Write a protein that binds this ligand. Structure first.
Ligand SMILES: Cc1cc2nc3c(=O)[nH]c(=O)nc-3n(C[C@H](O)[C@H](O)[C@H](O)COP(=O)(O)OP(=O)(O)OC[C@H]3O[C@@H](n4cnc5c(N)ncnc54)[C@H](O)[C@@H]3O)c2cc1C
Ligand SMILES: NC(=O)C1=CN([C@@H]2O[C@H](COP(=O)(O)OP(=O)(O)OC[C@H]3O[C@@H](n4cnc5c(N)ncnc54)[C@H](O)[C@@H]3O)[C@@H](O)[C@H]2O)C=CC1
Length: 509
């Protein structure tokens, strides 16, 4: 029995714990299958895993001491460091004493008469708790790339989502399936170290340079000295990536101008930035979208010295969402021990003991095959848990037609359950969204303790409104889930919390 159960010990889990335990004095336990805190940063330790967000923003805001303390080696932070960082947050606030590691949750069924949650582990522990905090993140189970004959393969088959330790590249032919962000990081990291790399590319994507430089003692002092301002600007921005968000329209300058603005962002680095700090309409207007793409196509053709290769790396679709970030990805394809296989015009059909076979019957002989093939959507982490609310409805069935929430946090027919980095949340840097959501959830359970209430849920009506509020803003953009940003997200939930949780049925003891 607990005031609250937390599922997860990543960013959202760790803070949920700290806040509910130490700031609101609640009786709380946190669960994670992982042996250590960190979430995705414990699980994903492949070559080149790295924040998209800058080092000084990809962290908690609420411990001012730890900010002055924080190591800031590079502009962006490597997986080990993030894990060291969260590990050290656990150390400082002693949170592990209230985390059971190696302990998956199987089921959670809301008890309607005790107004609390029945949570049963995979081990078969039944714990009771008034409140359910799910911090499962946005990246669910990996994609299992159904490839005929994966069983026959007798070399190393590794998946980025479960990267083993003690992996050696030297002297080996290595295949990489996937050229989204994980696979670009993998390929950039390893192309230098292997005998031969084959990239199996299903869909060429746009990548810009990240520009992950070491941070001088002065650079780091400039950050620390003005850290309070840094955050206030994060809270007063759409993306919370510390960017001079632009309102300048793209086609409202010269071609020679536009060029030079893109070359500035490009020299600086970062995908958000190229897309939101150059101009203000790149995600909304098509001409602008096209202009942004053609800038990158141009870059691709300059860097990639072999035109036929440059061709295969060039996206073909009409409009471009967020570009990936890289650390010399396009450069990779110039080298003599890298080859690109367009696996949409020449797919993988079979896989024998020692090779991947594509459509034209070429046998790609590999010692090692790496799946960098991506994760399921937000709801997959939920749908994969036995979660049942009112009238024994399981989240599986309630969301069978796409995920839904109120404010990204609360679910209809699903009481005392509060989601962190949950679906229909804002598009922005992770740590600020998580802070925002945890603080808000904590205050509401605070309100609940003080107004002696014992049951909170969002209406079906509140939810659709919110589902609508996302579509209206969404359809104002090209992205053919909640946009309009963090600043306006934080407004929206303040408009709710200040109006006695409009759309939440607060039920009383
Ligand atoms: C390499 C990499 C770089 C990234 N860079 C950025 C970035 O720059 N900016 C950004 O905004 N985001 C980034 N992300 C994503 C984002 O910041 C992380 O996904 C975020 O830290 C998630 O924190 P979380 O605690 O909400 O969820 P997670 O960290 O995914 O933690 C969820 C935890 O819950 C546990 N869990 C789930 N289901 C169950 C269950 N049934 N039982 C028990 N435990 C369960 C899991 O073990 C997991 O540890 C990145 C992700 C990766 C992999
Ligand atoms: N930029 C960053 O710092 C990072 C961001 N992320 C987050 O995760 C998201 C992307 O996840 P990723 O793991 O990078 O990959 P992804 O989610 O883009 O994976 C899909 C890719 O895998 C390949 N693929 C999948 N199934 C295939 C099949 N059957 N045949 C051939 N190829 C196939 C395709 O090339 C495809 O582009 C990002 O949008 C971001 O939110 C994750 C890691 C690093």
């Amino acid at each position: 029995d607990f005031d609250a159960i937390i599922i997860g010990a990543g960013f959202g889990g760790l803070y949920s714990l700290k806040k509910l335990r130490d700031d609101f004095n609640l009786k709380v336990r946190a669960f994670d299958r992982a042996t250590e805190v960190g979430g995705t940063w414990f699980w994903n330790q492949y070559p080149g895993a790295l924040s998209d967000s800058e080092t000084h923003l990809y962290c908690y805001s609420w411990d001012k001491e730890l900010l002055q303390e924080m190591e800031i080696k590079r502009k962006y932070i490597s997986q080990p460091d993030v894990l060291a960082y969260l590990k050290r947050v656990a150390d400082k606030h002693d949170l592990r004493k209230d985390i059971q590691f190696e302990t998956g949750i199987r089921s959670a069924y809301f008890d309607e008469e005790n107004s609390f949650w029945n949570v049963t582990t995979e081990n078969d522990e039944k714990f009771t708790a008034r409140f359910l905090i799910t911090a499962l993140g946005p990246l669910s189970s990996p994609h299992l790339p159904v490839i005929k004959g994966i069983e026959t393969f007798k070399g190393e088959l590794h998946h980025t989502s479960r990267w083993p330790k003690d992996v050696t590249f030297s002297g080996k032919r290595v295949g990489v399936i996937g050229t989204g962000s994980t696979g670009v990081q993998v390929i950039t990291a390893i192309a230098s170290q292997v005998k031969h790399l084959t990239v199996f590319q299903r869909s060429a994507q746009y990548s810009v340079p990240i520009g992950n430089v070491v941070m001088s003692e002065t650079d780091v002092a400039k950050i620390k000295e003005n850290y309070d301002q840094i955050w206030e600007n994060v809270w007063n921005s759409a993306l919370g990536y510390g960017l001079n968000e632009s309102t300048l329209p793209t086609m409202s300058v010269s071609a020679e101008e536009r060029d030079k603005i893109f070359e500035k962002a490009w020299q600086e680095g970062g995908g958000f930035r190229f897309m939101f700090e150059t101009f203000g309409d790149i995600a909304v207007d098509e001409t602008a979208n096209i202009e942004a793409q053609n800038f990158i196509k141009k870059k691709i053709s300059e860097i990639v010295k072999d035109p036929f290769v440059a061709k295969k790396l060039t996206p073909t679709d009409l409009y471009a969402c967020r570009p990936l970030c890289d650390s010399g990805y396009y450069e990779i394809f110039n080298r003599d021990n890298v080859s690109l296989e367009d696996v949409k015009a020449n797919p993988i059909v079979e896989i024998k003991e020692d090779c991947v076979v594509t459509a034209d019957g070429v046998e790609h002989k590999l010692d090692m095959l790496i799946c960098a093939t991506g994760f399921d959507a937000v709801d997959g982490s939920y749908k994969r848990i036995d979660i049942r609310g009112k009238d024994g409805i399981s989240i599986k069935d309630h969301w069978k037609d796409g995920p839904n929430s109120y404010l990204g946090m609360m679910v209809s027919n699903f009481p005392n359950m509060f989601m962190v980095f949950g679906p229909n949340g804002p598009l922005a840097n992770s740590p600020p969204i998580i802070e925002t959501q945890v603080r808000w959830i904590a205050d509401l359970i605070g309100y609940a303790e003080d107004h002696q209430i014992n049951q909170i849920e969002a209406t079906k009506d509140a939810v659709d409104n919110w589902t609508n509020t996302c579509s209206d803003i969404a359809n104002k953009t090209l992205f053919a889930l909640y946009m309009g940003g963090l600043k306006e997200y934080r407004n929206q939930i303040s408009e709710v919390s200040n109006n006695n949780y409009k759309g939440c049925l607060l039920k009383q003891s």
